Amino acid sequence: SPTLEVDALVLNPGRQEASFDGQTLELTGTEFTLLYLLAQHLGQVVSREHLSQEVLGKRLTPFDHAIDMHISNLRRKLPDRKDGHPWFKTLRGRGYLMVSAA
Numbered sequence: 001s002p003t004l005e006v007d008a009l010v011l012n013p014g015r016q017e018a019s020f021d022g023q024t025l026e027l028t029g030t031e032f033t034l035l036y037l038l039a040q041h042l043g044q045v046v047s048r049e050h051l052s053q054e055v056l057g058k059r060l061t062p063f064d065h066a067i068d069m070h071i072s073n074l075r076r077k078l079p080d081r082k083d084g085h086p087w088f089k090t091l092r093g094r095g096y097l098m099v100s101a102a
């Protein structure tokens with residue numbers, strides 16, 4: 001899979017490694033998986049069901065908030081974008097997107 005860039009973030013799937021402005025980030029494999037999947041669909045909503053299966057290998061239930069917890073942890077770990085945008089947007093029910101540059 002190809003290396004993806006968003007803002008100063010670089011996602012290299014060949015190493016399952018994320019870097020920001022040239023510095024490697026301390027991400028779990030699960031975190032990397034989630035980031036890369038959202039970045040492939042940059043600016044478009046990815047379903048909770050798809051994220052649950054692809055990132056966690058499990059079927060979504062209405063009481064499982066693990067993907068949102070991953071987003072919470074990612075928002076703590078990721079430096080602020082140079083471009084000022086959020087990294088993510090939550091679309092209630094529909095899932096999450098990684099925010100496009102404008």
Ligand SMILES: [Cl-]
Nearest residue numbers: 075086087088
């Ligand atoms: Cl964000």
